[PDB]
Amino acid sequence: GIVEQCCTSICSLYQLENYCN
Amino acid sequence: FVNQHLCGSHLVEALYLVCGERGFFYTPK
Ligand SMILES: [Cl-]
Ligand SMILES: [Zn+2]
C-alpha cells in the first residue's frame, strides 16, 4: 500500500495525490 | 518535484500538504 509505496521504497508527490478524497 | 522516503507521521504530513482541503485517507497495511 501507501507504506510500501513511500516508506519502504520512495514515492512522488504525484503518487500521494492518489490518496486524496 | 522529487521522490523521497516518507515514513510514519512524515507521510501523513506530506498527504496533508498535497491534498489539503480535499481530505485524504491513510490506510496502512
Ligand atoms: Cl526522522
Ligand atoms: Zn521524524
Q: What is the torsion angle, in degrees rounded to the nearest 10, for the CA atoms of residue A21, residue B6, residue B10 and residue B11?
A: 10
**Which 3 state secondary structure label does DSSP give B4?**
strand
**Which 3 state secondary structure label does DSSP give B5?**
coil
Way it was determined: X-ray
Domain borders along chain B are: 1-29
C-alpha cell recorded at residue B27: 490506510
Which one of A1, A11, A20 has the shortest CB-CB distance to B6?
Answer: A11
Which one of A2, A12, A17 has the shortest CB-CB distance to B11?
Answer: A2
Residue A6 contacts residue B10 (beta carbons within 8 Å): no
Q: Rounded to the nearest whole angstrom, what is the distance from the C-alpha of residue B17 to the centroid of ligand 1?
A: 18
Q: What are phi and psi of B16, to 5 degrees?
A: -65, -45
